[PDB]
Paper text:
The kallikrein (KLK) gene family is the largest protease gene cluster in the human genome and encodes 15 serine proteases that have sequence identity varying from 40–80%, with a high degree of structural similarity around the active site1. KLK4 is predominantly expressed in basal and secretory cells of the prostate gland with lower levels of expression in a number of tissues including breast, ovaries, thyroid, testis and developing teeth. Over-expression of KLK4 has been documented in malignant prostate, ovarian and breast tumors and is associated with metastasis, and mechanisms underpinning resistance to androgen deprivation therapy. In order to investigate further both direct and indirect mechanisms of KLK4 inhibition here we describe the structures of KLK4 in complex with SFTI-1, an engineered SFTI-1 variant, and with nickel (KLK4-Ni).
To gain more insight into this mode of inhibition, we crystallized KLK4 under identical conditions but in the absence of PABA inhibitor. We also show for the first time that in the absence of PABA, a nickel ion is bound to KLK4 catalytic residues His57 and Ser195, stabilized in the crystal by interactions with Gln183 of two symmetry-related molecules. It is therefore unlikely that this nickel site is physiologically relevant. Inspection of B-factors together with discontinuous regions of electron density in loop III suggests that the KLK4-Ni structure is more flexible than the KLK4-PABA structure. Loop III flexibility is also consistent with missing electron density for loop III residues 74–75 and 73–74 in chains A and B respectively, even in the presence of stabilizing crystal contacts. With nickel bound to this site, we observe discrete structural heterogeneity in the active site of the KLK4-Ni structure; the Asn192-Gly193 peptide bond can be modelled in two conformations: a canonical conformation where the carbonyl of Asn192 forms a H-bond with the backbone of Leu143, and a non-standard, flipped Asn192 peptide bond with a loss of this H-bond. This non-standard orientation has also been noted in other serine protease structures and is chemically inhibitory since it negates the stabilizing effect of the oxyanion hole on the tetrahedral intermediate during catalysis. In addition to direct effects on catalysis, we propose loss of the Asn192-Leu143 H-bond will increase the dynamics of Leu143, and destabilize its interaction with Ile16, shifting structural equilibrium towards Ile16 release.
Author numbering: 16 to 38, 40 to 67, 69 to 74, 76 to 125, 127 to 130, 132 to 147, 150 to 186, 186A, ...
Write the structure that this text describes.
Amino acid sequence: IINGEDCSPHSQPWQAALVMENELFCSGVLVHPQWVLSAAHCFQNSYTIGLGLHSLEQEPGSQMVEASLSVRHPEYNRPLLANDLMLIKLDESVSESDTIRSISIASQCPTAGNSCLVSGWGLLANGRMPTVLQCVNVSVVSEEVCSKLYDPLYHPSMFCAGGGQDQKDSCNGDSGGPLICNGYLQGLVSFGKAPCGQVGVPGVYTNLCKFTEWIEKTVQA
Ligand code: NI
Ligand code: NI
């Protein structure tokens, strides 16, 4: 996370850490006690998912869960970089707590100007990993602007957020992480232009308002 602050501990109880070989590579979002929503490009053959966390590895009530089952969106990367979402089925349901809670997905598609929140353990402005979960606010960008600077990769499965002079943005490690608007999960950290935090270049997020029916059906199967 670029230019953010240490999260107030367990303020984001839906944050799911995706680790392999004792190393974080992506994040995810708890949308159901046995289901984690993430970016399709965070796909792995098996998952080690950390819940109720703030530091990594340390915190009680925290759970480390196995996951051998995930479902990328059938149209992921068709066209290029589009439909970047997947669902992970936990081996065991999680018992929700105060530090582990689910969030619902926004029905309404994103609104230009809305100040939203994105969280993760991604790189900082200094280029080094944090020890504490990072939060930061970015504002949704109008479609015309989002469509024109990301031509020809712009797709309706995408919406832009951030790109302000405050240089607040998500980066490597934040992938698959949540974009919370108005208490609802509005998007997933998908991609941007390198480097992170460029003025005038908003981050691109998975437009979850377009997959509510796909997500539901996948969970019911
Ligand atoms: Ni704590
Ligand atoms: Ni990524």
